Design an enzyme around this catalytic site. Structure first.
Site, PDB file in Angstrom:
ATOM      1  N   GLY B  23       0.843  -1.227   0.000  1.00  0.00           N
ATOM      2  CA  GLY B  23       0.000   0.000   0.000  1.00  0.00           C
ATOM      3  C   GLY B  23       0.861   1.254   0.000  1.00  0.00           C
ATOM      4  N   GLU B  24       0.212   2.422   0.058  1.00  0.00           N
ATOM      5  CA  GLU B  24       0.939   3.680   0.132  1.00  0.00           C
ATOM      6  C   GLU B  24       0.190   4.812   0.844  1.00  0.00           C
ATOM      7  OE1 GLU B  24       1.073   5.263  -4.240  1.00  0.00           O
ATOM      8  OE2 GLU B  24       0.944   3.076  -4.205  1.00  0.00           O
ATOM      9  N   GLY B  25       0.921   5.915   1.076  1.00  0.00           N
ATOM     10  CA  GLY B  25       0.382   7.240   1.468  1.00  0.00           C
ATOM     11  C   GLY B  25       1.049   8.396   0.691  1.00  0.00           C
ATOM     12  N   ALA B  26       0.706   9.643   1.032  1.00  0.00           N
ATOM     13  CA  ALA B  26       1.328  10.833   0.421  1.00  0.00           C
ATOM     14  C   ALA B  26       2.855  10.938   0.489  1.00  0.00           C
ATOM     15  CB  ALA B  26       0.702  12.106   0.983  1.00  0.00           C
ATOM     16  N   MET B  29       5.606   4.378   1.223  1.00  0.00           N
ATOM     17  CA  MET B  29       5.044   3.128   0.656  1.00  0.00           C
ATOM     18  C   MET B  29       5.362   1.978   1.604  1.00  0.00           C
ATOM     19  SD  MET B  29       6.017   1.208  -2.983  1.00  0.00           S
ATOM     20  CE  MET B  29       5.256   2.394  -4.078  1.00  0.00           C
ATOM     21  N   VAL B  30       4.446   1.015   1.719  1.00  0.00           N
ATOM     22  CA  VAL B  30       4.658  -0.171   2.529  1.00  0.00           C
ATOM     23  C   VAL B  30       4.799  -1.381   1.596  1.00  0.00           C
ATOM     24  CG1 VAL B  30       3.611  -1.719   4.228  1.00  0.00           C
ATOM     25  CG2 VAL B  30       3.242   0.745   4.456  1.00  0.00           C
ATOM     26  N   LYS B  45       7.934  -0.068   5.868  1.00  0.00           N
ATOM     27  CA  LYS B  45       7.415   1.208   5.417  1.00  0.00           C
ATOM     28  C   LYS B  45       8.534   2.136   5.069  1.00  0.00           C
ATOM     29  CE  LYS B  45       5.406   4.099   8.217  1.00  0.00           C
ATOM     30  NZ  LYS B  45       4.406   4.673   9.105  1.00  0.00           N
ATOM     31  N   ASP B 140      -6.509   7.633  15.055  1.00  0.00           N
ATOM     32  CA  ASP B 140      -6.892   7.136  13.752  1.00  0.00           C
ATOM     33  C   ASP B 140      -7.239   5.692  13.748  1.00  0.00           C
ATOM     34  OD1 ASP B 140      -7.668   7.537  11.036  1.00  0.00           O
ATOM     35  OD2 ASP B 140      -5.649   7.421  10.337  1.00  0.00           O
TER      36      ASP B 140
END
Lengths: 14, 351
Positions: B23-26, B29-30, B45, B140
């Site tokens: 997966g990823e974020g801004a 990446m994982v 990560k 979160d």
């Protein structure tokens, strides 16, 4: 495919 | 040359190999990988935070927090990789044990038995007890942040939005706005946006419980302002007492403007749920955060009585204090703190 709860170490202790 | 996943270099070899995208974020990446040294599968990560102050802040918090924490229901950090000098450090890689799935995925594929829901909820709250005993707010919690193995072991992940709030000090007016993921967001994040408490985490857990019961999110707001309408569509309009508790005048007046809405009973929404589950649900999804059940009382609720054992529910030895909070600092200073915080994983470290 999800196993029985008693396969969890934490649950075995309870 | 190091391995590359979907255009991102993962400079983590030779110890960690066979990288696969997760997966990823801004700003990261994982991937999954294999630890050739310990012969275990890991999640890694990659974070690239150093151009933005807020990313640096969150990276430092997550690192400091997770490096102190040690608990069976919270994912630990095994390793941190970064460059040997601060000028060469652009990326930081955090290594954890690979878990098999998460609750978000599991809920797409499986209707859980009441026994599974009960045990997962126990584990979430046992982890949360530890987090809250440390004076940390997660901020979160949601199904994709709850990792699971097929043995039903659950671990809370993602401390990228987490922070310390030392209860010796009133933080009203000083907390970051617009925290949590929208559907899991407590009403006071919208109405007391700089003055919420760790009670927001209980609200998110209630949302998660509702979601286990029905395999769908309870409050799927399409946008920030619609979120609050979804909440009030089920809870109904708040009592006059609960309104009179809202210190912020604009917020209190905004609610007074809204049309009246009746409470939808939990058992019409969840006609097949265990009654005790619904009782605990009601207490977690309480509008007024000062009346909302706290984590210890939730663990003691009848729904969890086959698991509740305060002799086997650790709390933090050294809760974090106000010292661990003054990170409102320039990004370059935060980079130095991240470098120091990760130094113990480097060859040749000395304290």
């Amino acid at each position: 495919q999800l196993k029985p709860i008693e396969s969890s170490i934490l649950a075995q202790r309870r | 040359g190091p391995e590359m996943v979907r255009g991102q270099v993962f400079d983590v070899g030779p110890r960690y190999t066979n990288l696969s995208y997760i997966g990823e974020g801004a700003y990261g990446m994982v991937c999954s990988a294999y630890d050739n040294v310990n012969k275990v599968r890991v999640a890694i990560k990659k974070i690239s935070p150093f151009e933005h102050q807020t990313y640096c802040q969150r990276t430092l918090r997550e690192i400091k927090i997770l490096l102190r924490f040690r608990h069976e229901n919270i994912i630990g950090i095994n390793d941190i990789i970064r460059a040997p000098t601060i000028e060469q450090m652009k990326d930081v890689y955090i290594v954890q044990d690979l878990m098999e799935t998460d609750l978000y995925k599991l809920l797409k594929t499986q209707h859980l038995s009441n026994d599974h829901i009960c045990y997962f909820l126990y584990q979430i709250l046992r982890g949360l007890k530890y987090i809250h005993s440390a004076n940390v707010l997660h901020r979160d919690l949601k199904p994709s942040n709850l990792l699971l193995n097929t043995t039903c072991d659950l671990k809370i992940c993602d401390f990228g939005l987490a922070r310390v709030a030392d209860p010796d000090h009133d933080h009203t007016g000083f907390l970051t706005e617009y925290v949590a993921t929208r559907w899991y967001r407590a009403p006071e994040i919208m109405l007391n946006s700089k003055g919420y408490t760790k009670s927001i985490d209980i609200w998110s857990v209630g949302c998660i419980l509702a979601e286990m019961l029905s395999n769908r999110p309870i409050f799927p707001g399409k946008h920030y302002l619609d979120q609050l309408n979804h909440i009030l569509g089920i809870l109904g309009s708040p009592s006059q007492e609960d309104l009179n508790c809202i210190i912020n005048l604009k917020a209190r007046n905004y609610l007074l403007s809204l049309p009246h809405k009746n409470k939808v009973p939990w058992n019409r929404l969840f006609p097949n749920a265990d009654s005790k589950a619904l009782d605990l649900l009601d207490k977690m999804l309480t509008f007024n955060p000062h009346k909302r059940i706290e984590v210890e009382q939730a663990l003691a609720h009848p729904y969890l009585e086959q698991y509740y054992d305060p002799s086997d529910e650790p709390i933090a030895e050294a809760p974090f204090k106000f010292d661990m909070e003054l990170d409102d600092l320039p990004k370059e200073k935060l980079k130095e703190l991240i470098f120091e915080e990760t130094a113990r994983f480097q060859p040749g470290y000395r304290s």
